[PDB]
């Protein structure tokens, strides 16, 4: 059953019924990031209400804001973050009424996007591909060994669903990060050409070649590993078809093959888009020189 | 290697946080569970007519 | 009337109906009538909708401790008004503890008879006992 | 190096200077979730502008909004999502002038939190602990082998 069981109309109706909204202006976003940083420096992963207020005061000071009503403003900001599902509040009778706060998976994901310096690493990709290759090989061996529904669920379905699927999602996220890095290089090339285009030709050619080289190295790493991964997914599919055929394992293997095809196709498409931009920049440089 | 020592220290700190969270969550749930049971017993059993 | 007439606030009613349930409670009869503001507050939040009741303290309340302390202070103030009305007596030397009296049963005037709530309410307003808001 | 290389005052000054902000009213959030569902059903993980306008039209119908100026509203929504770093826009001469859109890591994390039915699984945790135990054991054997 598709990870996303709801059709677009059912989802829009569900979202409207629940009134979900995110409003994080610069001050609120800075406060979320300050909280995320303060939480990472602690041993218990918990923050008290007074500590959150002190953090909000430091943000107000950084924005040169009036010290008037800061306790009230901090409470409104804390209530807004709880209301927007960014913070979980625990009110225990045992704590004499003192509330304990923890960041939600959403609040951590948003804060990490801005604070965590995520750079695309060929080493990270090679490691992730090495772990997934080993996991797929073990799942393929277990599938070929055969067994009962319990053997297939614990040794084939669980590793594919809770390990291989998560690593593929991580690789996809790394590809999306590479997409953002390419757009950053495009902005830098446009800026270098707007400042001093004659002195920027050498720098632009180096940025274009380095980005092309990285995309090619990545695609080469993905193509070299992709065949071995596809072979292991096919081994599991053949073993499943031979041992009756769990529809759940077949659907999961098909989803993994589709995700793997998307991961392999993205690299070729990114190279084609980059080739198009490279030609455009060279045409622009030729037109400007002429 | 200062890089490996710092990374190992960070992972140990994360592991301690992960282990500590479970005990804290259990204490908070116990406080609530006791309170709901006390409330139900008070609502049910103490009015007798 | 030759003498003016006035009505109690809804927070006074919440504290009044809770003081009434406290008087009846045989579970706490062992205290010999001595209760603490904290116990009253704990019972009140146990029964009523905490977050929706918080709307009366401040229109922006969402469970913040400053707002929780503000609620506790309003309770402390209204309870003092009920003391002047003779509905509760503080201890001679300790102001965090007090004793109830039977006068609190007037807060149960809307339910002492097992009948239609609307008709009861109509009867009460007709008798001059209670007004709507 | 602390994963977060910057102190709180440095981070606040940095955030203020870059003017980062997220504004996702109920309609824009629903549009983001609609894009995520449509992208997950596709083989290429890419969306065209026409497909985004159609997705936005489906959202507008769900908000019972008038079909008037839907294309302008859709373009403004798409530009806003790109400005807020939720969508990456690729304009290739090779794609006959047609812009390609892909969700950013931020757009995926926000959409997954609401749409992915994430339930705690003891099996998931046991598997994750098994993989980390093997990875830590290999790393410890490698550290003891020296080099």
Residue numbers in the entry:
A (entry chain D): 1 to 290
B (entry chain C): 246 to 294
C (entry chain E): 81 to 213
D (entry chain C): 1 to 147
Quote the passages of the study that discuss this structure, keeping the authors' original sentences.
MukBEF folds the chromosome of Escherichia coli and related bacteria. The SMC protein MukB dimerizes at its ‘‘hinge’’ domain, which connects via the long coiled-coil ‘‘arm’’ to the ABC-type ATPase ‘‘head’’ domain. The heads are bridged by the kleisin MukF, whereby the C-terminal winged-helix domain (cWHD) of MukF binds the ‘‘cap’’ surface of one MukB, and the N-terminal middle domain (MD) binds the coiled-coil ‘‘neck’’ of the other MukB. MukF also recruits the dimeric KITE protein MukE.
